[PDB]
Amino acid sequence: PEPHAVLYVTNELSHIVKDGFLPIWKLTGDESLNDLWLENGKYATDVYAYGDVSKWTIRQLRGHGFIFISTHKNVQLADIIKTVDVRIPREVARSHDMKAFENEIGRRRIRMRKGFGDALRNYAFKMAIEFHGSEAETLNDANPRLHKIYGMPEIPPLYMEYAEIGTRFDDEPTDEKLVSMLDYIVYSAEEVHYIGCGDLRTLMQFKKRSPGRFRRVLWHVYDPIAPECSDPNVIVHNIMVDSKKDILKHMNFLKRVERLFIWDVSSDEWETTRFAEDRLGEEIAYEMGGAFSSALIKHRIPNSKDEYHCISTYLFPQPGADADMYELRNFMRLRGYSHVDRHMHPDASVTKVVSRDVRKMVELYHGRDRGRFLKKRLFEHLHIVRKNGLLHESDEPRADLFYLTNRCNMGLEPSIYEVMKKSVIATAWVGRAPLYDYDDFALPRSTVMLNGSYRDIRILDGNGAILFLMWRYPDIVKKDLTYDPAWAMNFAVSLKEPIPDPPVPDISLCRFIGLRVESSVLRVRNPTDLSGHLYVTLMSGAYVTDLFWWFKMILDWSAQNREQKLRDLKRSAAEVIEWVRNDLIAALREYKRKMGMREGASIDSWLELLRHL
Ligand SMILES: Nc1nc2c(ncn2[C@@H]2O[C@H](COP(=O)(O)OP(=O)(O)OP(=O)(O)O)[C@@H](O)[C@H]2O)c(=O)[nH]1
Ligand SMILES: Nc1nc2[nH]cnc2c(=O)[nH]1
Ligand SMILES: Nc1nc2[nH]cnc2c(=O)[nH]1
């Protein structure tokens, strides 16, 4: 909408900037603190800044919108010694193209999105059980034996009942057929019975690529040719498999587990044998549905048969697979213990398949330069419960990140606010700019501010949001984390967290950049100082902060005293950037006078809390 970043560059970089078309903020290591706040408030776009800033802490500098561009790895601040956000490569300085440099900032800035979202997610894992609007990324960092991960991910190409296919989507190369296999099917299994594992290259490559979850799984792997593997989570069997009894002697029943059965059995003048292998893997797993949560059975399509049967839940194509590779993978969901409730995926049952259509799947989706997104989709479809955030009622604490304000949801704001009333942490796109690579809609900021602040709920903007976890949780959100304040500021974030006692005016709360510019605009376009101050911040819709906590510091706190209030700052380990009950009631009224029905309740909710408090 308006928020910007200060694109702070270090000395060696300065001269190039000066050729740009963006503003240039020049320091000057003095500067007092209220000097920064009034200057920084002049810039409606992003800006460049250079010159000495050794006086200020990081939290301060992030409050302002600072992103650090330098050629060297870090810059000396007052707080700590920060890792430069954007490292300019030598040969890309240097050179002194103002464009190359600008495009270089952009790219990195786009990479920084993940750090912001990680920080939030990373808190949310510490503080919640349910997760909604989830996706591969959320799955990746989850404990699947603790967290419960939901959403409505975009369903892959599938065969059953059914079929429906295509339609076709753009796609890219991935890991080889058989490492890409493990990649999507290993998420919540604790014990894998891999049948026909071969030379074990497939498994070793999985180990070298995906080391965590390889280590966290027990592998009984089965093959006459299977080589010795020292690996202690890898129990090897030189047996050849023709029945369930071959696998049963290698299972603990006195102890619960999620088991996954994987069948990849091929021999060495028709091949109606390829067939009865595929079918035997099915037949074995089916006898053992009860022990296994699921199966992933090899599925080679016959030429000889025009239509045939099998026991299946799903039949899908294989990422990383060759274009001429005429082999699908069969998924059987079974009953057996699981950490993921998979009951939405039908019980494995007899399926009549039409070759020609199975034959089509391969044609459309296979390719040794295709599969990256297919693998993803398979991963989510298999392992995320298909539940709709807004409609889901939860007995356990719930996280609601980066989905709420998707276009899919438009017109359903009520259901949204409802979520942010009782979510551990959720987020709302509030950005009003052009605004690319993202397809959410914005919630008016006032309405967010006004709707979202409950006793237990701390309504902040992304950047404030972050600053707050730094301040109260130093090791969930490090000080040194790299992120993009301007982007953080495109979100409203809400956290089930108490108001600080004593409610000190820490940066996470009080920043209000360019408020003076913001106020004069109000007045040249739609006209009508702690009163005018509260009004402005609402009318502008250019800031999300936490009404409740804010109120409580204004009255219950300032004053208090020059002396006895800093003191409670010190102490609070808090910091700031800017150095009566009736003004505010007037403020609200005025605001609601200009907008009945675009709001307000609520409003009359906050008002009846002033003349009462
Ligand atoms: N399976 C299958 N293959 C087909 C079909 N139509 C053409 N083919 C070709 O026939 C070959 C598959 O039959 P086979 O000779 O038994 O080979 P395979 O068991 O699939 O495996 P490879 O030895 O790696 O080719 C491949 O080259 C396919 O491209 C079809 O409808 N189904
Ligand atoms: N900043 C940001 N981080 C993310 N991490 C995962 N998704 C997102 C997103 O949409 N934005
Ligand atoms: N199979 C698979 N696909 C993904 N897509 C994004 N992350 C992953 C992952 O860990 N496994």
In this structure, what token pair is assigned to residue 189?
Answer: 């299994």
Cα–Cα dist 105/565, whole Å? 41
The atom number, within ligand 1, closest to the CA of 355 reads: 31
Cα separations in angstroms, 565 against 502, 559, 560, 574: 9, 8, 6, 12
Q: Is the dihedral of CA 576, 580, 581, 584 positive or negative?
A: negative
Helix axes 530-540, 515-525, angle to 10 degrees: 80
The atom number, within ligand 3, closest to the CA of 183 reads: 1
CB 381 within 8 A of CB 155: yes
Cα–Cα dist 218/234, whole Å? 6
CB 259 within 8 A of CB 336: yes
Q: Rounded to an integer, what is the distance from CA 606 to the centroid of its chain?
A: 33
Domains of the chain from N-terminus onward? 1-127+420-514 (no CATH), 128-416 (3.40.50.150), 515-612 (1.20.1280.200)
Considering only CA atoms, which of 477, 495, 609 is closest in space to residue 546? 495
Cα–Cα dist 287/281, whole Å? 10
Q: Which ligand is nearest to the CA of 356?
A: 1
For ligand 2, atom 7, the nearest C-alpha belongs to 117
Strands 81-83 and 74-76 turn out to be: antiparallel
For ligand 1, atom 7, the nearest C-alpha belongs to 303
Asked if the bond preceding 560 is cis, omega within 30° of 0, the reply is yes
How does DSSP assign 486-511, residue by residue?
HHHTTEEEEEE----SS----TTT--
Taking the CA atoms of residue 50, residue 55, residue 58 and residue 64 in that order, the dihedral angle to the nearest 10 degrees is -60
The atom number, within ligand 1, closest to the CA of 300 reads: 1
Cα–Cα dist 117/112, whole Å? 9
| Cβ partners under 8 Å of residue 166, min gap 6 | 157, 364
DSSP state of 71: S
Cα–Cα dist 355/304, whole Å? 10
C-alpha of residue 388 to centroid of ligand 2, in Å: 20
Is residue 97 helix, strand or coil?
coil
Cα–Cα dist 267/280, whole Å? 13
Phi, psi (5° rounding) for residue 327?
-135, 120
- For 34, the enclosing helix (H) or strand (E) is helix 33-40
- The neighbour count for residue 277, using CB atoms within 10 Å, is 19
Neighbour-count burial of 434, counting CB atoms closer than 10 A to its CB (0-12 exposed, 13-18 middle, 19+ buried): exposed
Q: Which ligand is nearest to the CA of 490?
A: 2
DSSP state of 289: B
* Ligand 1 within 6 A of CB of 324: yes
Helix axes 530-540, 445-452, angle to 10 degrees: 110
Considering only CA atoms, which of 592, 583, 546, 590 is closest in space to residue 445? 546
For ligand 3, atom 10, the nearest C-alpha belongs to 140
- The neighbour count for residue 218, using CB atoms within 10 Å, is 17
Phi, psi (5° rounding) for residue 210?
-125, 70
CB 329 within 8 A of CB 318: yes
Alpha helix (H) residue ranges in 130-174: 136-140
Cα–Cα dist 233/186, whole Å? 15
The atom number, within ligand 3, closest to the CA of 184 reads: 1
Cα–Cα dist 344/321, whole Å? 28
Taking the CA atoms of residue 311, residue 313, residue 319 and residue 321 in that order, the dihedral angle to the nearest 10 degrees is 10
Q: Rounded to an integer, what is the distance from CA 15 to the centroid of its chain?
A: 38
Q: Rounded to an integer, what is the distance from CA 436 to the centroid of its chain?
A: 18
Phi, psi (5° rounding) for residue 293?
-70, -35
C-alpha of residue 178 to centroid of ligand 3, in Å: 14
Asked if the bond preceding 559 is cis, omega within 30° of 0, the reply is yes
| Resolution value, angstrom units | 3.0
Is residue 76 helix, strand or coil?
strand
Neighbour-count burial of 228, counting CB atoms closer than 10 A to its CB (0-12 exposed, 13-18 middle, 19+ buried): exposed
Is residue 218 helix, strand or coil?
strand
Strands 307-312 and 349-354 turn out to be: antiparallel
∠ CA(66), CA(44), CA(537), 5° rounding?
90
In this structure, what token pair is assigned to residue 70?
Answer: 């330098």
Asked if the bond preceding 95 is cis, omega within 30° of 0, the reply is yes
How does DSSP assign 358-419, residue by residue?
HHHHHHHH--TT--HHHHHHHHHHHHSEE--GGG---SS-EEE-S-TTBGGGTT-HHHHHHH
C-alpha of residue 488 to centroid of ligand 2, in Å: 10
How does DSSP assign 295-354, residue by residue?
EEEEEEPPSS-SEEEEEESEEE--TT--TT--EEEEEEE-SS--SS--TTS-B-EEEEEE
* Ligand 1 within 6 A of CB of 79: no
* Ligand 3 within 6 A of CB of 379: yes
In this structure, what token pair is assigned to residue 125?
Answer: 């894992």
CB 578 within 8 A of CB 63: no
Alpha helix (H) residue ranges in 453-603: 462-472, 485-488, 515-525, 530-540, 547-554, 581-594
How does DSSP assign 231-249, residue by residue?
-TTEEEE----SSTHHHHT
